[PDB]
Design a protein around this ligand. Structure first.
Ligand SMILES: Nc1ncnc2c1ncn2[C@@H]1O[C@H](COP(=O)(O)OP(=O)(O)OP(=O)(O)O)[C@@H](O)[C@H]1O
Ligand SMILES: [Mg+2]
Length: 501
């Protein structure tokens, strides 16, 4: 439900207003033609204009198809790409790949198909497009149009930018509205943080830390920040909305308690991919527990509640002793200096609890004081049942290795070590990362499953819209599709023409 007036509020500014942006935007190929959703479409749209560029995009498109293709049909899709782009006769023959590079891929398929067959040629294409095609696209009307989208992105976010609907919960610092953008109609979830609740607690530092972690992560498996605006009586964090309920609910109230191993595997796989993205920024999450893994409407999961997460300077350790009783890694309970390893401890606790329907150190039916829980965590070896394949016992007791020095993924290799583990022997992370795999359970839609130091913090926190999620909102809500229109027969529309404003 877009507002009746949306075409105006999202009206492109005239190109003449974007001059500041033009000189300040850093002209990085990978950012402007790929990381930024709308710049990606604008560049691809620029390549369709000239013919002989268009085959390079058609190629990269099919490589992406081939990299997820079911392993049974991998080489079958390879042959098709070979007879379309890697053969001199074909009309969409890509020449900047070189007759060398293709002759090598020709025997790569004769030497059995792997997902990285065409990865060679693809880089050859990206190395070319970064060159001449990019700098034409910059001095073209499609980057002028990209600047207009950026102009709208940087526009100021206020309470009137949204519609705050039913409240889905209550939080430590405030309630969690279910807000909608007026112009686009996209649904999000507000995290309302009452003012004085921060002021009395001196929680500014941990509030700003959360906002900053949230906006620096672009992951499918971690809640994303789309907006950070301040109001007269709160500070809002607009995030990904997740209505599928949380994992705790599905482990216990929907479960046996517990999942089939194959069901738990899917969840683990995504949680693992989620942790990998946090760990690219060398950020540690530390709050892994079932009730913090949320499900969306399609049935996929994301990691929620990052208020306990901190960036770690590369090659430096942190100290904490924070978390939840029974989901705290040994090194945390001992208040030792640690790195990212607590998060693989948490993976072990999440895979165990999903298969067995209870914590690896606390019976679902057990009364135990906090002390004995921790004692077990540090001293007792957990037990497994016939609910666990050999493969699943293995991964868990490796992730639940007391000594974080011999714990999975805690070596230089990292999460790559964990994906290889035989528990994911049947999991295809490329297709998972691509959404090709169907979640095991799909949730039914209609279900319930006062000074200047503050003025400083306020403005540091209230930075506005986040770039990547805001451009995705435009595309998703077909606001890009409708508004991104040019002139009849490839001519300058009036908003991109300097001759008449
Ligand atoms: N991404 C989201 N989408 C929809 N609702 C969400 C989302 N994230 C959190 N919530 C809701 O927020 C409510 C709980 O609030 P919140 O997590 O902020 O603090 P809490 O419940 O007091 O405990 P804690 O923060 O320590 O986990 C729940 O009702 C949950 O459904
Ligand atoms: Mg919270």
């Amino acid at each position: 439900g877009k507002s009746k007036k949306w075409k105006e509020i999202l009206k492109f500014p005239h190109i003449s207003q974007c001059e500041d942006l033009r000189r300040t935007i850093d002209r990085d190929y990978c950012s402007l033609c790929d990381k930024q959703p709308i710049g990606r479409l604008l560049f691809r749209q620029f390549c369709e204009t000239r013919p002989g560029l268009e085959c390079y995009i058609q190629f990269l498109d099919s490589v992406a198809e081939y990299e997820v293709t079911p392993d049974e049909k991998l080489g079958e899709k390879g042959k098709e790409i070979m007879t379309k782009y890697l053969t001199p006769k074909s009309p969409v023959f890509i020449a900047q790949v070189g007759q060398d590079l293709v002759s090598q891929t020709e025997e790569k398929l004769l030497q059995k198909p792997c997902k990285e067959l065409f990865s060679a040629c693809a880089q050859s294409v990206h190395e070319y497009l970064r060159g001449e095609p990019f700098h034409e696209y910059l001095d073209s009307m499609f980057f002028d149009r990209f600047l207009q989208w950026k102009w709208l992105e940087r526009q100021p976010v206020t309470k009137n930018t949204f519609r705050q609907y039913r409240v889905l919960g209550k939080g430590g610092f405030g309630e969690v509205c279910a807000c909608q953008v007026r112009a686009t109609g996209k649904m999000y979830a507000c995290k309302r943080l009452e003012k004085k609740r921060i002021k009395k607690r001196k929680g500014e530092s941990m509030a700003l830390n959360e906002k900053q972690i949230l906006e620096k992560v672009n992951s499918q498996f971690v809640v994303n920040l789309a907006y950070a605006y301040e109001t007269k009586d709160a500070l809002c964090l607009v995030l990904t909305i997740m209505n599928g309920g949380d994992l705790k609910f599905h482990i216990y109230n929907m479960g046996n308690p517990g999942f089939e191993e194959e069901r738990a595997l899917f969840y683990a796989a995504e949680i693992l991919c989620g942790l990998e993205d946090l760990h690219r920024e060398n950020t540690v999450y530390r709050n892994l527990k079932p009730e913090n893994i949320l499900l969306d409407d399609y049935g996929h999961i994301r990691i929620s509640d990052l208020g306990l997460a901190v960036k770690i300077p590369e090659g430096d350790l942190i100290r904490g002793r924070v978390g939840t009783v029974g989901y705290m890694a040994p090194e945390v309970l001992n208040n030792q200096r640690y790195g990212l390893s607590p998060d693989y401890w948490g993976l072990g606790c999440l895979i165990y609890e999903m298969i067995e329907g209870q914590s690896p150190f606390r019976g679902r039916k057990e009364k135990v004081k906090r002390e004995e829980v921790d004692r077990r965590v540090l001293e007792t070896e957990e037990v497994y049942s016939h609910k666990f394949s050999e493969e699943a016992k293995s991964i868990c007791k490796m992730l639940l290795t007391k000594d974080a020095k011999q714990r999975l993924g805690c070596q230089e290799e990292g999460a790559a070590e964990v994906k290889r583990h035989p528990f994911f022997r049947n999991m295809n992370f490329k297709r998972l990362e691509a959404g090709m795999l169907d979640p095991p359970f799909v949730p039914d839609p209609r279900a319930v499953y006062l000074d200047h130091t503050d003025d400083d913090f306020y403005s540091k926190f209230s930075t506005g819209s986040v770039s990547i999620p805001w451009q995705n909102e435009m595309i998703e809500t077909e606001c890009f599709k409708e508004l991104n229109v040019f002139g009849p027969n490839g001519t300058l529309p009036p908003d991109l023409n300097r001759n008449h404003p």
